Design an enzyme around this catalytic site. Structure first.
Site, PDB file in Angstrom:
ATOM      1  N   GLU A 189       1.009  -1.228   0.085  1.00 38.17           N
ATOM      2  CA  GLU A 189      -0.132  -0.308  -0.322  1.00 38.17           C
ATOM      3  C   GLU A 189       1.019   1.556  -0.058  1.00 38.17           C
ATOM      4  OE1 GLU A 189      -2.518   0.650   3.847  1.00 38.17           O
ATOM      5  OE2 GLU A 189      -3.651   1.896   2.491  1.00 38.17           O
ATOM      6  N   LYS A 217     -10.392   0.359  -1.613  1.00 40.85           N
ATOM      7  CA  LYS A 217     -10.068   0.955  -0.241  1.00 40.85           C
ATOM      8  C   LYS A 217     -11.598   1.173   0.755  1.00 40.85           C
ATOM      9  CE  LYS A 217      -7.244   1.182   3.559  1.00 40.85           C
ATOM     10  NZ  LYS A 217      -6.081   1.797   4.350  1.00 40.85           N
ATOM     11  N   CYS A 245      -5.027  -3.129   4.321  1.00 44.86           N
ATOM     12  CA  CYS A 245      -4.167  -2.709   4.891  1.00 44.86           C
ATOM     13  C   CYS A 245      -5.231  -2.673   6.035  1.00 44.86           C
ATOM     14  CB  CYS A 245      -3.223  -1.124   5.365  1.00 44.86           C
ATOM     15  SG  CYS A 245      -2.786  -1.061   6.755  1.00 44.86           S
TER      16      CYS A 245
HETATM   17  C1  LIG Z   1      -3.416   1.865   7.239  1.00 42.40           C
HETATM   18  O1  LIG Z   1      -4.123   1.552   7.192  1.00 42.40           O
HETATM   19  C2  LIG Z   1      -2.845   2.073   8.466  1.00 42.40           C
HETATM   20  C3  LIG Z   1      -3.450   1.180   9.509  1.00 42.40           C
HETATM   21  N1  LIG Z   1      -2.787   1.576  10.844  1.00 42.40           N
HETATM   22  C4  LIG Z   1      -2.641   0.981  11.787  1.00 42.40           C
HETATM   23  O2  LIG Z   1      -1.780  -0.208  10.861  1.00 42.40           O
HETATM   24  C5  LIG Z   1      -2.275   0.998  12.849  1.00 42.40           C
HETATM   25  O3  LIG Z   1      -1.490   1.298  13.782  1.00 42.40           O
HETATM   26  C6  LIG Z   1      -3.648   0.082  13.749  1.00 42.40           C
HETATM   27  C7  LIG Z   1      -2.422  -1.216  14.424  1.00 42.40           C
HETATM   28  C8  LIG Z   1      -5.019  -0.398  13.039  1.00 42.40           C
HETATM   29  C9  LIG Z   1      -3.908   0.633  15.691  1.00 42.40           C
HETATM   30  O4  LIG Z   1      -4.541   1.450  14.890  1.00 42.40           O
HETATM   31  C10 LIG Z   1      -2.400   3.001   5.747  1.00 42.40           C
HETATM   32  C11 LIG Z   1      -2.026   3.765   6.884  1.00 42.40           C
HETATM   33  C12 LIG Z   1      -0.351   4.188   7.087  1.00 42.40           C
HETATM   34  C13 LIG Z   1      -0.218   5.228   7.026  1.00 42.40           C
HETATM   35  C14 LIG Z   1      -0.872   6.245   7.553  1.00 42.40           C
HETATM   36  C15 LIG Z   1      -2.241   6.202   7.103  1.00 42.40           C
HETATM   37  C16 LIG Z   1      -2.476   5.316   6.835  1.00 42.40           C
END
Ligand SMILES: *[C@@](O)(CCNC(=O)[C@H](O)C(C)(C)CO)Cc1ccccc1
Ligand SMILES: *[C@@H]1O[C@H](CO)[C@@H](O[C@@H]2O[C@H](CO)[C@@H](O)[C@H](O)[C@H]2NC(C)=O)[C@H](O)[C@H]1NC(C)=O
Ligand SMILES: *[C@@H]1O[C@H](CO)[C@@H](O)[C@H](O)[C@H]1NC(C)=O
Ligand SMILES: *[C@@H]1O[C@H](CO)[C@@H](O)[C@H](O)[C@H]1NC(C)=O
Ligand SMILES: *[C@@H]1O[C@H](CO)[C@@H](O)[C@H](O)[C@H]1NC(C)=O
Length: 463
Positions: free
Chosen positions: A59, A158, A191
């Site tokens: 991603e 997504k 993700c």
């Molecule tokens: C990604 O969706 C981020 C998902 N968030 C996490 O990994 C988070 O740390 C948990 C484990 C789900 C706990 O809340 C994609 C992404 C990456 C960077 C910035 C924003 C989104």
């Protein structure tokens, strides 16, 4: 039809665009994306050179994650529905301004390998569309899949955006996206989707996919939500092959890629110490055969409490208040409950490490921080320090090995993901099993010290 295939995933140290105050030009955006595609090409060619049938890339691997709606715009392309039947490499001018799709198509075709990647979609709209955003287009976080001829065979927007993904829109309805191959039926999601019902559960339950391909940019949160830990557990709980391709960026706790089968992890990679990318390969079965359906409350509901007159205390795990009991001896049997969930543990440590405390905990409630989802969790975990107020805090290392464990609980859901994580964030392939009556138990002494053994349950209906 073929009975096995070779899976590949690539953990990518992305080239991030620089911080600027206004959007870059289309031309600058494309030059950056092409610098990332140069590196992914190296992984794709290396995998094909080792006979891989499919490769997954992460991603945001092509343009990163620091955007608002307008700074993202120049990186976007209009990605058509795969029903149009289009091979960009062979018909490059069918839809104009699509050089990223073109290059991905050619990479797949020239190396005859399925290529899974994550890029950005734009869909221009008018005010006649009542849903059209004020600024004139939808913008989507988008997985694309190209087959070994270079044909576009899947496009997935997504569904479950993470807090801070303000640059993207949520699709109108959840998109259930599959593609069929000679080495199985594939589902796809991205993700954060892995924590939710739509589309992830539906792909397994309704569409009976054999394998999930999973681009991700996951930020690790111990004790239960480190990438290799939770992703491999989801695969085991849902009984599918799972190809997880993660960003490599230790600065934000991004690392954790692997290839997971229903019975076990097959390959995994975790690295907080270097800035290197990593290619993983492994054989998988096209159509995994499964044991009987697990009844997660069966054994747990059949016994009497293993302990009583517990000295219980409250502890915080990733913002959720668990009910804990401390493990006092080198061997023991404990039961602890919160509301509808009772958790049972039998164990024997290899050695009592005097300054190391382990606890058994139960949680049955609604999680709300950084997302909204209902949880039922039974966990054995290493407490961060000797103080019981740190049971549930992030703990990276431990010294206590276990000769045996067996964990179970009275889950009010059939969606339970069995997690085992060793010191230094290592998985334990082949060292444990799940029984038909819902027990997560050891097959032998653990090869390294234990950070956690956990049954992570989701009650999707109570979200
Ligand atoms: C990604 O969706 C981020 C998902 N968030 C996490 O990994 C988070 O740390 C948990 C484990 C789900 C706990 O809340 C994609 C992404 C990456 C960077 C910035 C924003 C989104
Ligand atoms: C209570 O915990 C102990 C471990 O300290 C369990 O002991 C069994 O140990 C033998 C080793 O000879 C194993 O073969 C078994 O696998 C263990 N228990 C199992 C399978 O349940 C003991 O059984 C536990 N008490 C229970 C489950 O009531
Ligand atoms: C960011 O700026 C640095 C320093 O000038 C440069 O070397 C690098 O190529 C730049 N990256 C992008 C995407 O412009
Ligand atoms: C595909 O290979 C052909 C070989 O002639 C060439 O046009 C092109 O450079 C290749 N593209 C990629 C992405 O490999
Ligand atoms: C699972 O087991 C419990 C208790 O043994 C039983 O009451 C329940 O009906 C079972 N459920 C399923 C779906 O097998």
């Amino acid at each position: 039809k073929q009975d096995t295939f070779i899976a590949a995933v690539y953990e990518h140290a992305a080239i991030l665009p620089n911080a600027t105050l206004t959007p870059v030009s289309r031309e600058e955006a494309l030059a950056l994306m092409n610098r990332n595609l140069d590196i992914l090409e190296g992984a794709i060619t290396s995998a094909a050179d080792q006979g891989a049938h499919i490769i997954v890339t992460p991603e945001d691997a092509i343009y990163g994650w620091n955007f608002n709606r307008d700074s993202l715009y120049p990186y976007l392309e209009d990605i058509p529905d795969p029903e149009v039947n289009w091979i960009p490499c062979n018909n490059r001018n069918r839809f104009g301004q699509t050089p990223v799709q073109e290059r991905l198509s050619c990479l797949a075709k020239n190396n005859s390998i399925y290529v899974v990647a994550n890029i950005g979609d734009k869909k221009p709209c008018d005010t006649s569309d009542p849903q059209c955003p004020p600024d004139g287009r939808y913008q989507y976080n988008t997985d694309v899949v190209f087959d070994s001829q270079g044909k576009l065979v899947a496009r997935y927007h997504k569904q479950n955006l993470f807090m801070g993904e303000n640059q993207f829109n949520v699709p109108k309805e959840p998109e259930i996206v599959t593609f069929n191959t000679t080495f199985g039926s594939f589902g796809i999601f991205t993700c954060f989707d892995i924590l939710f019902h739509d589309p992830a559960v539906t792909l397994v339950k309704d569409f009976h996919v054999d394998t999930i391909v999973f681009p991700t940019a996951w930020m690790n949160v111990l004790p239960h939500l480190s990438a290799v830990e939770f992703h491999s557990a989801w695969a085991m709980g849902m009984r599918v092959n799972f190809l997880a391709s993660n960003i490599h960026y230790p600065s934000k706790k991004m690392t954790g890629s692997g290839i997971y089968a229903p019975n076990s992890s097959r390959a995994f990679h975790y690295d907080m110490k270097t800035e290197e990318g990593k290619l993983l390969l492994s054989q998988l079965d096209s159509h995994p055969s499964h044991s009987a359906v697990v009844n997660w409350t069966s054994y747990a509901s059949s016994i009497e409490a293993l302990s009583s007159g517990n000295k219980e205390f409250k502890g915080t795990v990733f913002f959720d208040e668990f009910t804990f009991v401390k493990l006092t001896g080198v061997a023991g049997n404990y039961t602890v409950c919160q509301k509808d969930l009772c958790c049972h543990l039998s164990y024997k440590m290899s050695e009592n490490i005097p300054n190391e405390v382990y606890a058994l905990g139960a949680f049955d409630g609604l999680h709300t921080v950084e997302g909204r989802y209902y949880l039922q969790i039974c966990t054995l975990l290493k407490c961060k320090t000797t103080n019981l107020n740190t049971c549930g805090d992030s703990a990276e290392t431990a010294s206590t090995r276990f000769e045996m464990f067996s964990l179970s609980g009275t889950f009010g859901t059939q969606y339970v993901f069995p997690e085992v994580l060793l010191s230094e964030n290592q998985l334990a392939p082949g060292e444990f099993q799940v029984s038909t009556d819902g027990r997560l138990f050891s097959l032998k002494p653990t090869s390294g010290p234990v950070l956690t053994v956990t049954l992570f349950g989701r009650l999707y209906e109570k979200d």
